[PDB]
Amino acid sequence: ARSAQIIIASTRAASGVYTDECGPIIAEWLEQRGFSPLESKVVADGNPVGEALQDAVEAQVDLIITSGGTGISPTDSTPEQTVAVLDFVIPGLADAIRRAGLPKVPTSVLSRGVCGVAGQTLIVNLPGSPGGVRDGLDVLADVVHHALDQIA
Amino acid sequence: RSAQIIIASTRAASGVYTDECGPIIAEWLEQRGFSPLESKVVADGNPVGEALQDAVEAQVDLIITSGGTGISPTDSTPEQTVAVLDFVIPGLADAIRRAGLPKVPTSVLSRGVCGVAGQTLIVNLPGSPGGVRDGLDVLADVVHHALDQIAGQDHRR
Amino acid sequence: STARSAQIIIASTRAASGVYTDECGPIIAEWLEQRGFSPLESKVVADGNPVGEALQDAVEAQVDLIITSGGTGISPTDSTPEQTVAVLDFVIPGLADAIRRAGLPKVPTSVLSRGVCGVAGQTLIVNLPGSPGGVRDGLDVLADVVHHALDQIAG
Fold first, then answer.
1. Which among B108, B114, B124, B125 is the top mutation candidate for probing chain C, defined by the most C β-carbons within 10 Å of its own β-carbon?
2. CA of A20: which chain B residue's CA is closest?
3. Pick among B11, B69, B71, B88 to test the C interface (most C CBs inside 10 A)
4. What pathway does this protein act in (chain C) (predicted)?
5. Total count of domains within chain C
6. CATH number of residue C91's parent domain
7. Distances in Å between the alpha carbon of A47 and those of A10, A84, A141?
8. In this structure, are residues B96 and B135 in contact, taking their beta carbons and an 8 Å threshold?
9. CB distance B146–A72 less than 8 Å?
10. Which of C120, C113, C107 is nearest to C81 (CA)?
């Protein structure tokens, strides 16, 4: 069975007890699709995101899904942290995830999330909202199995 | 909010023709809570980058360029813009290109970027009046939100 | 008054052994003939450095258009995008995007293709997928823009 790691990228979330829906939404999607083992990290924006990515990549996790920190305000550094770890980017997948938020949420176009491969790990940046997360998972659902196989 | 319009066209800056895009952009800005500075019409290449740097250093909130985003030897607006940017916003440039479809297939050849430099938002638009209108229509729904975010005002989840 | 030349590069290591059934080359050749490209040349190279070698050669020769097929995925052997970006002066992201979108919605995995398009020297370079279907999808995207793109490159 394939392994997965969820990384909630949010200083706000990491500053207290996590009680938000996005982690569970993603974990439930993964769990119900038979990913195992399966774990969840909530980390602050900036270097802790890159640190968590590096940890999971060195551990050869099959799939990493991050949520949050993809926008254009000063604390949004998930794309930076992610690109720094990637071997290559998969632009069509990030574009598809953005497009899934249109026309309902015009500011979907401001998300700078990337997807890509690092080592033998697929990494997918999702947005921080439950709606954006669900939209992104629905995009991923039709390609994730094929993507993991092709990486292998 | 402040805005700077930059027309990138050696032929307009000469000027062998009168630019139509600048006034379109200016009216659009004025409808929407922007106070435009005097537009600049500059020749392609380094003058574009120099006008971008001047505006960023003067902390203009929004810069909109028009022209020089194609793939001819003198289309260097994307190169000049990227050189000034801190980061790009790919989804916005994409949406601006898609807005030209399916009516103008060569819209897909535009290499315009959008991004942030300092606390300034920079948007590359095409050099045609039609392309500018299509792009402004895209920008309309997101531009104030974007500027608020770049100013450091936000609500992280 | 001068016609545009086109080079077809099929990126497939297998086609060096008796894979022998490259269906895509002929499809692209026919499509190029139909759009006035001449002369035409086609070749198959293995994944990796030979692709870049083939790209570099045709760019130095001022070939007008290069279409590649294959090696644009996310497998460990898919290196066509890396090889291409190494030769490019700049990318044309809208074109690669349109080619990917042409595979939707019937082929969801189209979004995994990392092919690029761009200009090197005076040469337009277009990465297409390795499947006959993806090639046909990509060629349909090029059909109403490729000569316009070469017009612009030349001025």
1. B108
2. B157
3. B71
4. Cofactor biosynthesis; molybdopterin biosynthesis
5. 1
6. 3.40.980.10
7. 12, 11, 29
8. yes
9. yes
10. C113
Q: How far apart are CA B138 and CA B89, in angstroms?
A: 14
| Residue of B81, B109, B113 best to disrupt the C interface, most CBs of C under 10 A | B109
Beta bridge pairs of residue A118: A121
Element (H, E) at B35: strand B35-36
Helices (H) and strands (E) in chain B, counts: 7, 7
Of B91, B146, B156, the CB nearest to A98: B91
| DSSP symbol at A59 | T
Helix pair A91-99, B90-98: axis angle to 10 deg: 70
Q: Which residues of B touch A (CB under 8 A)?
A: 87-92, 94-95, 116, 138, 141-142, 145-146, 149-150, 152-154, 156-157
Q: Which helix (H) or strand (E) holds C10?
A: strand C6-11
Q: Which residue has the tokens 């290591």?
A: C13
Helical (H) or strand (E) element with A91: helix A91-99
Supply the angle between the helices B21-31 and B129-139 in degrees, to the nearest 10.
Answer: 20
Nearest to B113 by CA among B90, B136, B139: B90
Q: What experimental approach yielded this model?
A: X-ray
Tokens read off for A138: 């629905």
Q: Containing domain of residue A115, as a range?
A: 1-152
Chain A residue whose CA is closest to B144: A107
Is the omega angle on the peptide bond into residue C39 within 30 degrees of 0, that is, cis? yes
Q: Entry resolution in angstroms?
A: 1.9
Closest-CA residue of B relative to A109 is: B91
